[PDB]
């Protein structure tokens, strides 16, 4: 009766099945009967190759029919039947969206089938989860288009992915013993042309360690449309604040890899990504990403991730083509906010003094500190704004907190090496050194007695300071 | 806003008690003071044979936004179109000031009616007619006033 | 406002900003401006003494926190550092005096418009009066708290002088007897729409009541005593009357109240004995069902009350003389009967043209009520009642035709035949009593 | 046609709108109802003759008609041929006769308007340059068309017989069995029968609503049956009235869910319809928006002509679809949201006009009136023409026969009038605009409406001198002044939208009536001796006080106003202001000045009319007549005229500093 595929035939099918179930061990025999209908499609048959006695020709139609049957029965299904059923809902050979919109009038009514698909997804929550990912295309072909709003303004990640009924938090945060999603990704990669929500709903579910791979093997996809980088950033800044403090090397390298591929994918194509006055949303998104990534590092050794975030903001500002004064106000505001966020982060995570001696062999309490200061100032920002009159001032103020004599002793204690060929932090160090020498020589206490200070350039600077 | 309409009420009272002897039969609806209707009665020829009905609408931003004056009676002027719109420099947005009371506007527009200005016309052809042959303009305006002009009070 | 700090005294802050919040609300210049009543109501139930007040404080703080968190993500995070922004604000720092007074003032300014919008979305038509009312049964407070703790059920949005609209154009201190009227009305409209579209018109009532029992509101309401649900029932019925139908009267309010109750009772008796949906006969959605089954026979009835208010006075005794609203609806028929009696009573007044007008304004409702298909199914006694009502309506309709033709003509053209036509109309009226069916031979 | 550049063309709707603005012929809109004062048949005849006129003009020179007709730029030939096809279709649908006979009748009209040589068309512009001459020419055209149309039925059989006698189509066998000749010449025919006669098997016309319009306008129905004429004049638009309740429910739901300003992020209508959590609501709203868009498309042709609310033409130019923008359906009153509001306004206006005319014709009195807050399904006129109107109108077409033998069609207007009146049109009350759903957009922060509300509710009076002295001495600090300003502004907002007692001084009001707890006791001591009946005055004083305090120290006193008003005064103007301050009520003057400045000099878009070249006297006397009634002559006759409004906060600075010198250096 289900043939041909129409709303009237679907309604008659549902009524007839309801009457059949009302009138008529029974469902065991029914399932054993439906398995013989299932098998030919699993053997790859479709269309003419299907058995002549098969009452259903299309496969999504029989998938919907069996979904209706299992919904009106409230029973369980064997695990081997999950792969067989989920193979039947993938819209294979349905790459254009025109055929999806042509099949939509046969499936007009919207939310009851949403309910059945949700309970199918929750019923396939079992530990097979192999052919599940093909249902989201149908779960989004009858859903709203991509909302152009900002992160965390509209609503949480559930509606951005378009699911709103599946909790993927436990899968992204567990022991990854099932690597099947990656191979399925490289198997059915050409699906995402059918609709747009699939990129978001798929970035939501991919684990952290495989997100870099999922990112750089979509180079052709991002060349087809230079606007899904927005959604990649949306996903990253959605999942980032939820993840807590990173204290490990696995997450360290995973985030390094994904950020590195992010810079690659942003850089290679063109400035054309930032067309149609889309720079504002990109700036807001990169600011939120920087804010989220800065608040999850409190180990003084994961500075490189904020470094790449700062470099991302740098390159995003650099590729902006000149145009009104609104853009200049926007860029001043975003630079000020970035510097404020970095300043607050370095205020928060570094709770201790500096170069406490404690051993007559004075050494830094936060030894991996100078590299952090160098790395998070070397990025390029416009000189009309701060980032040079503010963070260098932070260096000056931090170094004016230490006693002149102890700081001078540490200044060439075989730690502050590697003169960076007019490094700005090196110039700040020389300035605070000459001020400390001036203060020490202003008092009547001897300053140089035991310097094991074989580096000669800073001996020269010290001598020039003491004479002058 | 009614804050404005209070000042228009004061203006109407003072103009009615003072009298103008040339702008008669003023009427207004009390539920909406922002629309005045009046009858221009000129004194100088060739416009001494009829009177002309006018309507002045006051924007809610009055006294500050200048009122807009339209002519409800067809009149043969080089300065007023068939739509009735009239350009008065004392009311133009770039020359408006709040102290300009409605009686000064009425006096200025009546004086302009009695003595047209061709250098800034709204009907170019009538300006050319006045400039190149005064007699033709005289007969045309007199005939227009005769055929379409309202009955004098 | 995050639950489990002592970094601020939130109750003190809300008592300080309630006045400023309520000061910015604007009614429509005559719609029972109750600003002083609102602020007093809030400040006598924003305390920590009673258990209901403590739970209300917790729920209101939760609402304030969620609204503030939703509105904070719009900021550029330079406003998230409120302390730093306000400190760098020399103007307000030297305006409010000491630095902590300045910080408290900035918190007051930030919070007051959100609280104003919250009060606008809470006191839609006097919903605070129910919490203010003493000795109110437990159901009022319980549904108020259930609605107040459900952000998804009641979305409160924020916008500057904000306007509050009167849904019912309520009279002087009407204070609709259900906590949130428009909210449940719209939610039940949506639920009925979903039921009516999911299934066809064969099992609509069962699916509607089942899907109302599926919502958390239904399962929460199911635990109340039967008497409390009954009180809820007539309160909901009267406020539904007020919201859907405007009425310039209080007696007619109770009259259509009884009419809709009798319609609900008749709809309950439409099914023989399903004994599954009959387990919940005293429920809210039934009222909606009644409307969507009997809308015509309600609205037409309202017409009879609006065109000719005088009939109401007659009806004020008719309910006493016949005990209407027992099993089904006959109240529009009673209004028609009393109206017909008064029409034959006054008859040719000093202005018989006015009599023509007051019979012809009301012809169409009595034509519509006396129609087939108008009553899908009812008892045999109502069949006899409707038979005699069409009989009398056709009788007085022929009388009205006779009047509006001959009495109009003689008074308009030749005033010399009135004493004869006034007796001949009486003769034809008295000769048609026994046979109220003109299709037969003898009446013609 | 070159001489007809932007000339007043006839047979066009008037709201001037010169030109040839007409929609695409392939539209589902109105039936092109007649204009204000012309019969529709004469209107259509004149319109088709004029259409042929510009068709000939365009074929002579296409560019002239391209520059005359506004919308299209491609070609006039197809557009005009589609107009002519639609005109002939409407002609053959309206006239009750064969299409060949309708072409015969139009040819007869064209030939009959040729022998009317008697000239009485005088006093009209040949260039159609004035509306009066256009109406005059239309009046002559109506007169001649009536004179020609009143004598056409006596020539149709004769012309048919003469044309059928043409001895070149007479050889064609078709015209014998078609154009009025017996078909008995065919040998393959049944024998002569009393039922198979030629006239019994003859064609007859069909009854249609347009033919009803024709019959009621040709019989002078204005004085006998005007109700039917008014009903069929706008029957096309009232055919959409049945959809009023659900679209009103749409406006109600949109207002209820989105009582917000500048908070909607939805861009497409499809997104809204498809972003709802209920499928029943989803498909309901789908059907409802489909009906809304169909009614909008069918009715976007008379709103810009007779609708009470003026609208730009940028909304009725593009057809609405499921993927259209979002703001069209929002019931707003400013722009692009006025579509549905104006549509429902026109629907209510036509309903009210019809019920009013019907009452003024027959009822003469009715008290049955209702708002839009209880609109039901049957309350509005709801009928289907194919099932309701057609049978009720066709039931009253009597046939009359004579002894000689003839079949005449006659209409009893009383019968059909009583039929249609006693079914739908009677029992409809007078709808009022009180309860129309509408989103609120603007704000009342400007603080003047608050002051006039205070003056309406309460009889405001001046502040006591002792009270003002005590509050001035009590509020000498700046923080106290700011707290007093905040509290008094809160109470001002409270009093603007609520009542109060003119007595009941502010202290007891604050302490318990709104139950505002104690912040500082000093402001309470200040409020101890001020009444509510001076509250607005108190505000202004205290406001000025605050800014005066900002003048006393070295802090910037505005920090918000535009830089175009922040400049110093000239030397001569300083001397003039000093000589003014020499003798004047400086306290009141500075109070009024600060009341002015802080309200409207707010920075950007403060120069909409406030051009910085005016004088203080002019603007002060322009303001002072609004709500205040303070001392007058001291600024009318003494204040200098050459003050250069641009630098007017400088005048306030000078006045405040001189007042400081008065108060402090004096004592």
Numbering used by the authors:
A (entry chain A): 512 to 535, 557 to 855, 863 to 1007
B (entry chain B): 0 to 152
C (entry chain A): 3426 to 3429, 3472 to 3626, 3637 to 3921
D (entry chain A): 4418 to 4432, 4499 to 5150
Study authors write:
As prior data (RING domain independence and activity with UBE2L328) suggested RNF213 could be a transthiolating E3 (i.e. covalently receives Ub from E2~Ub onto an active site cysteine), we used an activity-based probe (ABP) based on an E2~Ub conjugate, specific for this class of E3 mechanism. The probe structurally mimics E2~Ub but is chemically modified to undergo irreversible covalent labeling of an E3’s active site cysteine during transthiolation. Based on previous biochemical and proteomics data, we used the E2 UBE2L3 to generate the ABP and appended a biotin tag to enable detection (biotin-ABP). The 3.5 Å structure, revealed that UBE2L3 is bound via a well-defined interface formed between the C-terminal domain (CTD) of RNF213 and the L1/L2 loops and H1 helix of UBE2L3. CTD residues Phe5093, Trp5097, and Tyr5106 are oriented to undergo hydrophobic interactions with Phe63 and Pro97 located on the UBE2L3 L1 and L2 loops, respectively. This contact is putatively strengthened by nearby electrostatic interactions formed between CTD Glu5108 and Arg6 in the UBE2L3 H1 helix, and CTD Asp5101 and Lys96 in the UBE2L3 L2 loop. As nucleotides were absent from sites AAA3 and AAA4 in our RNF213-E2-Ub structure, we postulated that RNF213 might have reverted to an inactive conformation during sample processing, rendering our structure a covalently linked “footprint” of the activated transthiolation intermediate. To explore this possibility, we generated a second cryo-EM structure where the ATPγS-stimulated ABP labeling reaction was applied directly to cryo-EM grids. Modest structural changes were evident (RMSD = 2.66 Å) in the AAA core and new density at the AAA3 and AAA4 sites allowed modeling of ADP. However, there remained no clear density for the RZ domain nor Ub and no apparent basis for activation of transthiolation.
